[PDB]
Ligand binder design. Structure first.
Ligand SMILES: O=c1[nH]c(Cc2ccccc2)nc2c1cnn2C1CCCC1
Ligand SMILES: [Mg+2]
Ligand SMILES: [Zn+2]
Length: 328
């Protein structure tokens, strides 16, 4: 209810407020507006203050990070914005500022923003099978994750972008180690491994234990990385069509190149509904269930929309199956 019209880059008090909740419509904003949101997060979380980040260097770094993201259907800058915004949402919801140090908060946020830098739009499975430069460079060990990670520190290496320029070397080393651990923890090949490791520490969780906290941070970045279905139905749905577009781009290339095609990327096998029912039930729900053990507030805010979505895709599945029989 402002007295005058302000530019799009000058976020309204309403936008600033809405940004703290996972209900935030990530689709309503252009890159420059999304960049202003990310900037606000760093200031609001006290990261600019506590780490003596130069405000112009923060903006310069964010702009560079944006430039280093590719125009892929799913693995684009908007995805990186979701992950970071969900991380920001979880810092407030779970009251992470109480349990975690500002260094940990800086790690969680910086890694969330950087996690998919210069993604080619073709998964590790393609990279390895196609014997790409990345696969040969990283010896088939999480090539993409290692690359996003490498690109992240290559950006921060540039003086005009170094947001950690005023952080002592000992501090920088800690942030670097943490960010690396987190960005590499995003590889879905390690999901089962990371989940089992966290569930083991769950038996008697200790916030004063470094090993426990590292696994929690890993689980948190993983939560934000795949958190699309947690968001309202209208916000969550367009992302599934985005992922399918990127997956079909790969499966077509894999078919053309004579390489094996993943069934969940296969045009004649994958369904928007069937893929989501499985992902929500067996990947999304169990992961958020263990987070709820530490943070009960996650159930009402994040498990409830996941249950709602599972039930909807199950309803949609019945319609698709009926329609596909007529097409046969
Ligand atoms: O919400 C999702 N559903 C599915 C499941 C799925 C959806 C559509 C087609 C095929 C699978 N997969 C997902 C989602 C989010 N990220 N990912 C992947 C994990 C590694 C990066 C991409
Ligand atoms: Mg990734
Ligand atoms: Zn990702």
């Amino acid at each position: 209810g402002s007295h005058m019209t302000y530019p799009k880059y000058l976020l309204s008090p309403e936008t600033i407020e809405a940004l703290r909740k996972p209900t935030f419509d990530v689709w309503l904003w252009e890159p420059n507006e999304m960049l202003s949101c990310l900037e606000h997060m760093y200031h609001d979380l006290g990261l600019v203050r506590d780490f003596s980040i130069n405000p112009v260097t923060l903006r310069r770094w964010l702009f560079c990070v944006h430039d280093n993201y590719r125009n892929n259907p799913f693995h684009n800058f908007r995805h990186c914005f979701c992950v970071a915004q969900m991380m920001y949402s979880m810092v407030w919801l779970c009251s992470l500022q109480e349990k975690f140090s500002q260094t940990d908060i800086l790690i969680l946020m910086t890694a969330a923003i950087c996690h998919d830098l210069d993604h080619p739009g073709y998964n590790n499975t393609y990279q390895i099978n196609a014997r790409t430069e990345l696969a040969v460079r990283y010896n088939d060990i999480s090539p993409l994750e290692n690359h996003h990670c490498a690109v992240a520190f290559q950006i921060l290496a540039e003086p005009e972008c170094n947001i950690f320029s005023n952080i002592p070397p000992d501090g920088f080393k800690q942030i670097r180690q943490g960010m690396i651990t987190l960005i590499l923890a995003t590889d879905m090949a390690r999901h089962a491994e990371i989940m089992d490791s966290f569930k083991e520490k769950m038996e008697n969780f200790d916030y004063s234990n470094e090993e426990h906290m590292t696994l929690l941070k890993m689980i948190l970045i993983k939560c934000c990385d795949i958190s699309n279905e947690v968001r309202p139905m209208e916000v969550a749905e367009p992302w599934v069509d985005c992922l399918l577009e990127e997956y079909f781009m790969q499966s077509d290339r894999e078919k053309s190149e004579g390489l094996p095609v993943a069934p969940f990327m296969d045009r004649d096998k994958v369904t928007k509904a069937t893929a989501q029912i499985g992902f929500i039930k067996f990947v999304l729900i169990p992961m958020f269930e263990t987070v709820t053990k530490l943070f009960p507030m996650v159930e009402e805010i994040m498990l409830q929309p996941l249950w709602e979505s599972r039930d909807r895709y199950e309803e949609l599945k019945r319609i698709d199956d009926a329609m596909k029989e007529l097409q046969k």
